[PDB]
Amino acid sequence: KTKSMEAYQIAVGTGNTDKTKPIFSFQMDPGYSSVLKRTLLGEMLNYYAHWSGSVKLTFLFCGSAMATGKLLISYSPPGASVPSSRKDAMLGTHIIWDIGLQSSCVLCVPWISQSHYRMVQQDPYTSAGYITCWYQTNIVVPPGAPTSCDVLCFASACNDFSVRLLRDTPFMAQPGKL
Amino acid sequence: GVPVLNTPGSTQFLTSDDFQSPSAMPQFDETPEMHIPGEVRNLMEMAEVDSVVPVNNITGKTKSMEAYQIAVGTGNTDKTKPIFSFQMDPGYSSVLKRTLLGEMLNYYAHWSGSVKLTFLFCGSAMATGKLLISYSPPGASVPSSRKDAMLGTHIIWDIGLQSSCVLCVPWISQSHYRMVQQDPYTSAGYITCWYQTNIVVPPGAPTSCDVLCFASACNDFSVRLLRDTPFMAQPGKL
Amino acid sequence: DRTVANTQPSGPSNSKEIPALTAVETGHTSQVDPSDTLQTRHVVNFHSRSESTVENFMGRAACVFMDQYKLNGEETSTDNFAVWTINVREMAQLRRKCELFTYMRFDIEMTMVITSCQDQGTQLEQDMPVLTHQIMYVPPGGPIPAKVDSYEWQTSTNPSVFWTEGNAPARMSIPFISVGNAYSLFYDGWSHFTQDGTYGYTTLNAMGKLFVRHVNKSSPHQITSTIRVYFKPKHIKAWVPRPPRLCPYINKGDVNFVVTEVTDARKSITDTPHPE
Amino acid sequence: DRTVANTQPSGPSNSKEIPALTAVETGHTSQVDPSDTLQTRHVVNFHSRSESTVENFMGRAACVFMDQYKLNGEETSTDNFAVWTINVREMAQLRRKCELFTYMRFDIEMTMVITSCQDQGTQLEQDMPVLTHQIMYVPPGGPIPAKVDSYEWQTSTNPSVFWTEGNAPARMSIPFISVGNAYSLFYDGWSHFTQDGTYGYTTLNAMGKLFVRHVNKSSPHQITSTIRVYFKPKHIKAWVPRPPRLCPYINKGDVNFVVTEVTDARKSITDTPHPE
Amino acid sequence: LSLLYHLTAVSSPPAFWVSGWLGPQQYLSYNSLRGEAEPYWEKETTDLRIKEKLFLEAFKALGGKGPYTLQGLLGCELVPTAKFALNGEEFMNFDLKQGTWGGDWPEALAISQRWQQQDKAANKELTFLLFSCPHRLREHLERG
Amino acid sequence: DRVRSMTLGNSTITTQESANVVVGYGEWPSYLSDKEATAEDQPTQPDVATCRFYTLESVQWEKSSPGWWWKFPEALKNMGLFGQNMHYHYLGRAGYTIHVQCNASKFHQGCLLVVCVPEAEMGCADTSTTFPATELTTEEEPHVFTSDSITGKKVQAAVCNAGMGVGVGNLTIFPHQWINLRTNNSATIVMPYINSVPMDNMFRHYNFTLMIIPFAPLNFNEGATAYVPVTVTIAPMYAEYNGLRLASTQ
Amino acid sequence: DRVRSMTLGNSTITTQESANVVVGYGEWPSYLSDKEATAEDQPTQPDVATCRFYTLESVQWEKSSPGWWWKFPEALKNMGLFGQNMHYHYLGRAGYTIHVQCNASKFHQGCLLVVCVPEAEMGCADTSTTFPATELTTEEEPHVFTSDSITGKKVQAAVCNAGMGVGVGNLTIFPHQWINLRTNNSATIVMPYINSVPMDNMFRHYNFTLMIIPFAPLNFNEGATAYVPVTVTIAPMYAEYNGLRLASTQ
Amino acid sequence: DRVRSMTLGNSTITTQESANVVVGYGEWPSYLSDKEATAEDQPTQPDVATCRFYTLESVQWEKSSPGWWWKFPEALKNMGLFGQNMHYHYLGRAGYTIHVQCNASKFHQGCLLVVCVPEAEMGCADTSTTFPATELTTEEEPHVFTSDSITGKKVQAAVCNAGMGVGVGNLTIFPHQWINLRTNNSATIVMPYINSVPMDNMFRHYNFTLMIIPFAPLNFNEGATAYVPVTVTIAPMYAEYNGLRLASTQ
Amino acid sequence: TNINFYKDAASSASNRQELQQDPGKFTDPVKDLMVKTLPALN
Amino acid sequence: TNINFYKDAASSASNRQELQQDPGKFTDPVKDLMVKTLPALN
């Protein structure tokens, strides 16, 4: 699915199967998380060693206009495990997205870091939380509408976002002369 | 351009220089400084803090909690003998070193100022006595009797509600600063404790009580010459 | 140094104002703060973004040219001088940073960290005086040296710096040498008007060549010096930012690439690296 | 420069004021001067504590990194560059001074006293030009060199200094590189939220790595250089002071120690070293 | 082909042993008791001694007193491949860019930091994976 | 608002479900200023002859379509007086308002990143060589991305990346407008004249690429319109033209 | 004064022989300021739900007892709503008022250094390895120092040193209050939130250790109460909590 | 207006077709006033910890579904800090904003009376006896009405009546919001704290029942989404809590 | 620091102190103002 | 001496001249003022 256009599309579907299972689940750190890295926010952080500020994850629905549902996307602060049920997800920070005319509801995750700046690299200390999406209500589609729709997550930064310590990006890793 | 002559002391890394230097990360946005409680701005502020003195350096008693406890007892035996006796210099005296004041001085070569030795009684509340703690200035031998102790600087501590009487030793140094290292010149005096009155305890109270000495520094205390601490003596790579 | 915007205090809101519900289809990134979608506290944020500016991001000096030019005998060849058609693309570390923006107007500090090491050989007894290195920037279209002792090293008008080994690396601030008003880090057009010829940035921003040599005529035994030109783009006026390069660079003349994954693959869409 | 408080004049006192009699059980160090408990004279004390401040105590620069990186031939290995995960703990001399305080916000001057000595060998005839040394601070999470001639030495954004041997040691003032508002010299917590993982200061204050190498590509015969990074913590805003370390340091990642005596043992509680 | 040293060690045992497979065939059988790379060989023996010391320090890095069967699949496929497993479950990998081990497991970060404490151990791993493993793979392919 | 009308030149674009108009980097197009000018050829300024929505060939959005890219100054060659002035003028500056119309019913699923990437220098399928102009610029048909890696002496149209060796999903830094069939029936990106030089040849230089990349593949149940086109109309407002000379043989 | 009363939250602590209350480094606890804040999650501030004296397990002061240490943010896990908010919040800031009550008769001898040491990073008995979390943090019982050197993969609890490789008697630099049975029946140390970062995880990070180290061993003649307990109550005043998320499995 | 956004606590509810928000009896929720207060325990007031939309289990609207009822203070037990404070506090007052989201396409028929009935005392299937608590309060799943009369020692869930022996269609006197799939994709009922006593136990007392009763059964032609869920999210704004004590074993 | 010792403007220091930003160029590029509180479309 | 030749604040000299101290943080940390002359307890 990666090295393709299936990497960005979050497959949200009309079904009873695995609707108490996360639509997606990754770590909030744009720096070292394989999901939130290699994007504008993630690659921007990878050029630094310390980062701060709220991350807005804008979830754009890509499906039929007749499709309607509710997706509960939750940022869980560190200290516990990754959310395994929507009950554990709504305890932390969560946003309920009603699929509709807007269809681009954004989970603007807060800054609940213990320190002023988190670590871009894979550091167990001052790490971020986890982003998990769930089916608040199943996306009901008419017979003419496709059952399997998609979601695109957009990582962006707020007016509160900042980075501190410049560094060379580990992504490149130049082998030799070009 | 401007004619400049390379004066002596150039292209050298003096360890105690305040020269400026180009930054690795220009225009770096440092994390905003929050008001973290406990802003220590002088090392003497740490020295000024009463710190339990391992007075009882007796073998076995050290590397333990018996090092700090001065065993003061209810008896007729050796009550004309010092409760404890050591040298006043926090720098090289084995007793007053390895504490906040002592280790603070060991990071320097010259020190000055009065040392407060706060003597906290750790015994039964019914226990009552009098301990005469004396700082004797140098020039004579260490006090061997309480008569020789009261001649110098002494404080009579009445064990009671306070039970933390402090011998704030004076600054009777010939020079403005003493030597942290073991120097016979400009050395400090001697701290010796004696039984002014025997600590009488009721039958229900324990006979052998304890005393904890706290080395701290006054508002007059200061050090002059920075140096590497001899305590560490790093063997090699960690 | 203006800091980040402080998170304004917020409380429970059941209003008809939908901050989270927006439309990214419009091409507008939602301007919502955590207060907008969540109940937060009033924290006076002092997280300055000074080091996160293009001036500071490009301020870090990174190596752009690595070549080995040699001093040896009288058999002068092309290995006694290092030739570089001055381009950021050569080394990928700064190439990615520059290719994070389409156009950048900047004055470029060129620091030559020359490292001279005698080439391993049977006979190394030589005791050569301190090597002096000439780093000349040939203007685009100007004459370029053919040998280490050619007339082009007589810098009548070509800028040059003579640096003695052991001193501070030779830092020369090259001004904005561009025919246009910016440097096109990407040039989607072609070299010629007939939609042919060379393709890419190489056609425009044709910075003049840089030639490095040993001012010392010869050395009893061969000594190889690594020029290690580092670039510090300052006075940045970057325009049209671009995403940081994903695929590893293959060539310094084009952005030609071997297809790479969008990001590190993970077991499943629900796979979160977390402590057990 | 405010001096110490002058000893106020005092006389005989039989009052109900008990300066000596206090309670250290309260956690308050008695503020009594010699005048309070003894009859003293009025001396105007000028013993300034300027050199006894954390700014001056930490102002003394002490070596923090000792490693030997080598220049030799073309068989590049990990011994041609010196790697250091920048931490005060490495050398105990400054580690004890820093571990005299729990948190310290400071800008850190990093001075590289490179000492290059040719390795003793059968053949030392080589006459190498003046060695140039590159000292690059890799930001935490940034790419780190795999070889002495890797792309990571092209410092596009990583700070670096090129220093020629024989000049003043390369002094670079690294700013406050910390995610938090201070440097946790002690971190009683763990690396991960599950109360596991790495324990100690190493989890936080994750200063980026420092890589030192010879800018010169090769040397006819092997030459070993000792980097000898010395740290000068300036602009100190130290918080929560701690007692100077008693036990000798065993590891640079933890405060793990072999139990040591509280202080030097003495014959008896009444034993005073005194002249006879 | 794909060179893969199957590093393995037991905290409470053959304390440490390596199974180097140049392809599906096994060509190296290193053991802790022998201390030599029993099937050029001297350099591989030194590298595997460094790996043995790293594995011992990793065993010291884990706080738990229970048994720990550390494993790894170090090598290069002609691309370096580093996958470390604790108790038979993959827990950390060595990032070549950042040049350090890590993963979601807390023991992953503990072991990575402990190995980072060792002098140039991360860059020793970098040389082993990016340079030494492909060099040995090519040398053995030409030889065999 | 959803409904909108753009009247640039003779052509007029009416939309009912279009999202908000995006102005490229917030700068509205305008004629090259005298302070910003480099040529003294008194450029001609056709207000309506060249500044009008030229409708490009309709492109069908398929279920397996990876994406497409048009090189705008170039795509508009031999298409009206804008292309004629491209041929007849050495220099050229224009701000392009790209309205991409991709109409679909309420039962159609999908979303397109319709991003205008200035100087989107594409990579080659064989990295050593460089593709010909017939692979980058539209040649009787827009150029189409590929789902996986491709080889040969062609443009590396792997939709896996943005085409420049960069992350495609990170292309939103450039001005863009997503065509989500749920919300957007069209995308409107108003790119100003974006170039390093004040004016450049419109054939020699490709000012930008309109990359229309379906992130969610068009999925529709049977009975719905299979032919869902993606038309591209572009209006070069403020189409300045310096260096008038003989027509180029393009 | 000897008598004192502290009313923090629901719980109330009354003392009759307690010494003067120590405020950690002279700074009274307070909520994280907006100028000093780093997170924008609108932290919850339970004034009485979390800011109350939680009574920890009573510890008997023995004649041979070397000492004890509690990791405060951690010790209070699964103990009331403070522990619940620790589980449910990623970030956490609190100023802890630790009242240690060690009551004894007038015939009991001894003194305890009840010192709150911020970030008291302990050493390991085997220096090469590192102890597990079950050795540092209280696990059904406070962790107890040892009179002499100990070995094994455990915390170096040698009471000979402070536990960090440092002189134990020098610990008084940190805020402290001695429990001298002659004078003090309890110790009161008011530590503000003491950390480098504005907020940190209360399980990942141990803010401080309450080290209760008897310098003079408890000596009492026969007939006196042998069981002399050392209870620890701690009130996390101004217990701020950011990063609300799922409860940690601690 | 159809579109709406409610930001209560950490959670945020966005709607596009929701009808007008209903405030229970026109009184907006608020904290218990001192004039209206009966307890002097200084109640804790978590502004965001407890006052947030807790998403209950999704319930499928079936063609034969009679209806459902949740007991709100009770349903939210063991669900976040609101349930934790329910366990840990004897008294409790809260105003509940119930957003019931039942999304459906334009081809789905049906309407639900989503009525919040304060103190909806239900009847028993066998009138002589009384049902257990496992029949009224939600037990791993919401309780579902029955189309016809039922027997046994269970709640009389006959959807024929309102469940209290009263006309179900007359339930609209209580605050309500109909989920008509033609118009409403969700219902929003803002019930203030509605009780006789100023505060009552949230387990002992069921403040109200959210009865979602489909008056028109969900009818959809084949091919349309058969699984049409009815999610229930409830935000207890102004969740006051008196009588703090040990956690209830519920 | 602000003092320039060379007449050439290209010889001056890096403008590290200059912190300017207009995120509305890339984060808010729409022609019509889009308010966060207000619905973005219709 | 006071003149700073680099724009970066981290590039300035050591603040050796700054002599500030608050020993009351560590030597007088008690909430209630403890006067030396007055009895500390009762």
C17 lies within 8 A of chain I by CB:
yes
Give the dihedral of Cα atoms G165, B217, B120, G216; nearest 10 deg: 10
G36 lies within 8 A of chain B by CB:
yes
Q: In units of Å, what resolution does this entry have?
A: 3.1
Among D242, D251, D252, D261, the residue to mutate for chain G (most G Cβ within 10 A): D242
| Strand ranges of the sheet holding H12-15, from the earlier edge strand across to the other edge | A24-27, A130-140, A68-76, A93-98, H12-15, H4-7
Are the C-beta atoms of A50 and A132 separated by less than 8 Å? no
Residues of F in contact with C179 (CB under 8 A): 197
J10 lies within 8 A of chain I by CB:
no
Distance between CA atoms of C106 and D169, rounded to whole angstroms?
30
CB atoms within 10 A of CB J28: 21
Query: Using the beta-carbon criterion (under 8 Å), do E103 and C273 form an inter-chain contact?
Result: yes
For residue F102, is it within any domain? yes
Are the C-beta atoms of C133 and C224 separated by less than 8 Å? no
Place of tokens 């004021």: D17
Are the C-beta atoms of D195 and B50 separated by less than 8 Å? no
F173, F184, F208: residue with CB nearest C241: F173
Q: How do C68-71 and B110-112 pair as beta strands?
A: unpaired
Nearest C-alpha neighbor of H83 from the set H91, H97, H73: H73
Residues with Cβ within 8 Å of residue B98, at least 6 apart in sequence: B54, B231, D246, D262, D263, D264, G167, G170
Are the C-beta atoms of F185 and A24 separated by less than 8 Å? no
Q: How far is D267 from chain G (nearest CA, A)?
A: 19
Distance between CA atoms of B100 and B109, rounded to whole angstroms?
16
- Find the helix or strand (DSSP H, E) in which G172 lies: none
Q: Touch between chain A and chain D (3+ CB pairs, < 8 Å)?
A: yes
Q: Which residues share a beta bridge with B194? A: B132
Alpha helices in B107-196 (DSSP H): 146-151
Nearest C-alpha neighbor of D190 from the set A123, G154, A80: A123
Query: Buried b vs exposed e over B34-60: b needs ≥16 C-beta within 10 Å?
Result: bebbbbbbbbbbbbbbbbbbbbbbbee
J36 lies within 8 A of chain D by CB:
yes
Which three-class secondary structure state does DSSP give residue J11?
helix
Domain that holds residue F58: 4-244
Distance between CA atoms of C253 and C201, rounded to whole angstroms?
7
Which three-class secondary structure state does DSSP give residue H133?
helix
I24, I28, I41: residue with CB nearest F19: I41
Distance between CA atoms of G149 and A144, rounded to whole angstroms?
77
Query: Using the beta-carbon criterion (under 8 Å), do C48 and B25 form an inter-chain contact?
Result: no
Query: Would you give the end-to-end CA distance of chain E in angstroms?
Result: 12
F223 lies within 8 A of chain I by CB:
no
Residues of F in contact with A103 (CB under 8 A): 180, 182-183
Number of independent structural domains in chain A: 1
Domains and CATH numbers, chain E: 2-143 (3.30.500.10)
Q: Angle CA(H226)–CA(H227)–CA(H230) in degrees, nearest 5?
A: 130
CATH number at residue G174: 2.60.120.20
Place of tokens 């340091």: D249
Nearest C-alpha neighbor of B26 from the set G86, H150, D107, F108: D107
Residue H29 identity (one-letter amino acid): P
Are the C-beta atoms of D199 and D254 separated by less than 8 Å? yes
Q: Angle CA(J18)–CA(J24)–CA(J26) in degrees, nearest 5?
A: 95
Question: Which pairs from J31-35 meet CB under 8 Å and 24+ separation?
Answer: J31/G20, J31/G21, J31/G22, J31/G23, J31/G28, J31/G190, J32/G1, J32/G20, J32/G21, J34/D22, J34/D23, J34/D26, J34/D28, J34/D31, J34/G20
Q: How far is B225 from chain I (nearest CA, A)?
A: 33
Distance between CA atoms of I40 and C26, rounded to whole angstroms?
8
Residues of G in contact with J41 (CB under 8 A): 1-2, 19-20, 183
Are the C-beta atoms of C140 and C206 separated by less than 8 Å? yes
**Residue E27: is it exposed, middle or buried by C-beta count within 10 angstroms (0-12/13-18/19+)?**
middle
- In chain C, the residue whose alpha carbon lies closest to the alpha carbon of B26 is C56
Q: Touch between chain D and chain I (3+ CB pairs, < 8 Å)?
A: no
Angle at which helices E41-61 and E106-117 cross, to 10°: 130
G91 lies within 8 A of chain C by CB:
no
Query: Using the beta-carbon criterion (under 8 Å), do D215 and C223 form an inter-chain contact?
Result: no
Are the C-beta atoms of D197 and D191 separated by less than 8 Å? yes
Distance between CA atoms of D262 and B65, rounded to whole angstroms?
9
Query: Using the beta-carbon criterion (under 8 Å), do A137 and H12 form an inter-chain contact?
Result: no
Residues of A in contact with B25 (CB under 8 A): 165-166
The domain limits of chain C are 1-276
F13 lies within 8 A of chain I by CB:
no
Residue G181 identity (one-letter amino acid): L
State residue E139 phi and psi, 5-degree precision.
Answer: -65, -40
- Give me A125's structure tokens: 């200390």
Query: Using the beta-carbon criterion (under 8 Å), do G40 and C46 form an inter-chain contact?
Result: no
Number of independent structural domains in chain F: 1
- Give me B162's structure tokens: 């306070």
Residue I18 identity (one-letter amino acid): E
Give the dihedral of Cα atoms G70, G72, G78, G83; nearest 10 deg: 180
Residues of I in contact with J4 (CB under 8 A): 1
Number of residues that make up chain H: 250
Query: Using the beta-carbon criterion (under 8 Å), do A102 and I41 form an inter-chain contact?
Result: yes
Question: HSE of D135 in the Cβ direction (CA atoms, 13 Å)?
Answer: 27
Q: How do H12-15 and G93-101 pair as beta strands?
A: unpaired
Residues of G in contact with C47 (CB under 8 A): 38
C121, C165, C226: residue with CB nearest D130: C165
Query: Using the beta-carbon criterion (under 8 Å), do J27 and B28 form an inter-chain contact?
Result: no
Distance between CA atoms of B78 and B84, rounded to whole angstroms?
12
Query: Using the beta-carbon criterion (under 8 Å), do C40 and G41 form an inter-chain contact?
Result: yes
Q: Touch between chain J and chain D (3+ CB pairs, < 8 Å)?
A: yes
Residues of H in contact with C18 (CB under 8 A): 3-5, 14
Angle at which helices H80-88 and G80-88 cross, to 10°: 170
- In chain J, the residue whose alpha carbon lies closest to the alpha carbon of B50 is J27
Residues of D in contact with A31 (CB under 8 A): 141
D149 lies within 8 A of chain C by CB:
yes
A162 lies within 8 A of chain D by CB:
no
Query: Using the beta-carbon criterion (under 8 Å), do G153 and E63 form an inter-chain contact?
Result: yes
For residue H249, is it within any domain? no
For residue F250, is it within any domain? no
Q: Which of residues 106-135 of A touch H (CB under 8 A)?
A: 135
Query: Using the beta-carbon criterion (under 8 Å), do I16 and J7 form an inter-chain contact?
Result: yes
Q: Which of residues 195-224 of G touch A (CB under 8 A)?
A: 195-205
Distance between CA atoms of F192 and F198, rounded to whole angstroms?
12
Are the C-beta atoms of D191 and E113 separated by less than 8 Å? yes
Q: How far is C273 from chain F (nearest CA, A)?
A: 23
J22, J24, J30: residue with CB nearest G20: J30
Query: Using the beta-carbon criterion (under 8 Å), do E98 and D146 form an inter-chain contact?
Result: no
For residue G112, is it within any domain? yes
I27 lies within 8 A of chain A by CB:
yes
F35 lies within 8 A of chain A by CB:
no
Query: Using the beta-carbon criterion (under 8 Å), do I37 and C25 form an inter-chain contact?
Result: no
Among A47, A51, A166, the residue to mutate for chain B (most B Cβ within 10 A): A166
Q: Which of residues 71-90 of G touch A (CB under 8 A)?
A: 86-90
Which three-class secondary structure state does DSSP give residue E2?
strand
Domain that holds residue A149: 1-178
